[PDB]
Structures are given as C-alpha cells and as structure tokens.
Design a protein around this nucleic acid. Sequence first.
DNA 1: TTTTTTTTTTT
DNA 2: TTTTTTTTTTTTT
Lengths: 97, 104, 101, 98
Amino acid sequence: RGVNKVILVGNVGGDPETRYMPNGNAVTNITLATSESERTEWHRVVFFGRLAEIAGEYLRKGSQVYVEGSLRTRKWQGDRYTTEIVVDINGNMQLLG
Amino acid sequence: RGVNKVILVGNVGGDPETRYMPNGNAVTNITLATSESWKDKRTEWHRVVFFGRLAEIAGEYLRKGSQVYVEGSLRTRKWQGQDGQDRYTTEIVVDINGNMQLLG
Amino acid sequence: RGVNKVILVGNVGGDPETRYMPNGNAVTNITLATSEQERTEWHRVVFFGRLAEIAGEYLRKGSQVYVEGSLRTRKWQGQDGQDRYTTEIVVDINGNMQLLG
Amino acid sequence: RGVNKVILVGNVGGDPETRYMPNGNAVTNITLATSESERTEWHRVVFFGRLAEIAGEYLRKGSQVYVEGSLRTRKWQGQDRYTTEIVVDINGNMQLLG
DNA sequence: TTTTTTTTTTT
DNA sequence: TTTTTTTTTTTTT
C-alpha cells in the first residue's frame, strides 16, 4: 500500500534524447527546470512506451510541459545513484504553450 | 514559476532525527519506503526533509513504520565525494508550502 | 491538452454500494469526508472497472483511504423541473485507490 | 485529518470576474475547461487573496492555466442549490501558461 | 437525488 | 447584466 506521484510543470532543458530498447520500445530522456522562491531546480525525466515517442517527437529545448510520474532512484556504478521522474503508462505528459 | 510537487504515501524507514540549527529551526530527516504491488504469472526509498512547523510535528509523532502522507518539493543537492567526484542527492522537501499527515 | 486530477485522503462515510451491470462491469459508490473550527467536506467518489470491485471489496464505513481520480459534474433535472449539478470524483483505470491503515 | 487537492490544466471559458470584499480583498472566479480525448469538463474555480488579483489581471477567454486548490461544496439559498468549486487560496497555486 | 466519516495540530 | 452565455487541440495504479 503506497503512493508515489510527482507532478512537474516546467521548461525542457535540452532537446530530448530518444533511445530504443532491444525489444524496440522507445525511452526518452529530458532535463526539466522548475523555479521557486528565484532558484532553478533541474529534474531528470525519463519517458517510456508511447509517451517516449510523443516526447521525442514534440518536445524541444525551451518547451513548457506538464509531467506526471513517479520517483525512482537508479543504481549505477562507474556506486552512484540517479533519482528520476519515470513517466510511463501510469503517468501523463502535456505540452503547453 | 513552474510546479514542483511530490506526493508520497509510505512507511517511515527508521526512527526520525530532529536537529535544531543555530537559527532555532527544526529540521528533521527521515527515509520513506513506498511500495508498488505487481502481478503476473517493488520498494522505493525516499529521503524526506521537514523544516519549520512540520519539522516539529514530524519529529514528535513519526516512528519506525509509521504510515504517512507527505507532500513536498523535489530538491537535488550537489556535493563532491571524498573520491573527488561530484555526486547528487535528491530529496523531498516538506515545509510550510507542503503538508504531512500521519496515517492510522 | 488538459489535466483533471483530484487527490483525497479521507474517511468513508458509509459502506460501499457496488452495482453490477449486465456487461459485468461494476460501479461502486461511496462518500468521503476530508477535514481541515474543524471543517468536514463530503465528496461523492465513484469507482469504475476493476477499482469498482476492489473498492467494493475493501472499503467500509470509517475506512481511511487515498483516492486519485478526475472531476466530473453531472447535470440533471430535479422534480421541481430545475437544473441541478452533482460534481463527483471519478476513479477509473487512470486513477488510484489505496486503503490506508 | 485529510487531504483535499485538485490540479487542473486547461483553458478559461470567459474573462474573469473579480469582486471586492468589505476588507478590500479580491475574489476572482472563472470557469475552466479540461478536455479528455472530444469530451470537455467545466470547472468552477474561485481564487482568493493575492492570486485573485493576479488571476483577475492576466487571465482572459482562452488563456491556458495551471490551477491547484481544494474542492469546496457551497450550499446556497427558493430552495437549496449546491455548487462544488475549486477554491484556490494561500494553500493553492496558479500558473499562467503559454 | 442528500447522512455519514474520523479525531495525537503568512502553502 | 451572468447562474454557469463558454474554452481550446502540436494526436490502455
């Protein structure tokens, strides 16, 4: 019994990087900036499945986007950890502007 | 500008730590485990930080294995490890702009 | 391009009502109380699909529950002939339900 | 002990209406359209304090907006009529988009 | 088409 | 000047 939800509205940092799995499923990375206080926070968002395809085709540097997903910390050595907002079938993405 | 919102429901990993800093502020850190339950024929760990009033309420009531609702913001803190290399810790900051609700 | 999301943590006011349709799709109705002196807001939450059966199985009066859904306002003509409006929280495959406690 | 949270991103139906209470504080109301792919949903949003002024000043028919608030059902009144509104106050948030 | 639930505190 | 006069589309927990 848990909940793990993240909601972001911000600007795409650089043009998305789309990659494809051995099974051919797209996965797309962006960085995403939100501002508070004025302070900029950078988020690593990774899209999977159909939304990865929509991300890489429609987002550019500067895009304002809404993003809904869940937090997962990815373990990767050479021991380091990247916390990412994972956007898949249980989440959402909407291009604004 | 922008929106930076995190909503978690999970169990507190360990007894909370409350620390008061020279400015008189409570800051309490916990870890939080959120679990998703699969099916075919699991666990995520979050670092949460309370400041201010909710820091006081967190330190008082939360214990090992308390169920809690947490609403905060994402914050990633850069730091150089002892090996010289930069590393990154992403936390969930819960302050006056957030919200906490003990559950049960 | 739109977002329509509701998130509630609250207490069920009474036992669920799960209604099955000829198709075998279930619909489950509850009301749900959230409190901010103390001030209680009552929500009408309706579950569709699998989550209708899961809510029907697991929610009871007094249950503390998290729900994530979407807002839906239903228009209807009252016996007085006048337009009325019921705004509900719709929980279906795009939503979530987690029994708390 | 509860949570009562609403998050909408959609488009304003018409120009905001803003009024002033005795104490001088603004209150802005709008309707907001959210569309699901085809089928539109209309929400009644009410802003209080600071955000009411901001909403009053920069929102107009068709403005794309992010809104964060709480649900509140207000019984009014010649019998009773109940409206459920999205109340955006100090605890909420609003972001103009585009 | 209208009753309730629950109760460990300057977004 | 109204009781929601309508908005606006860069597409299966």
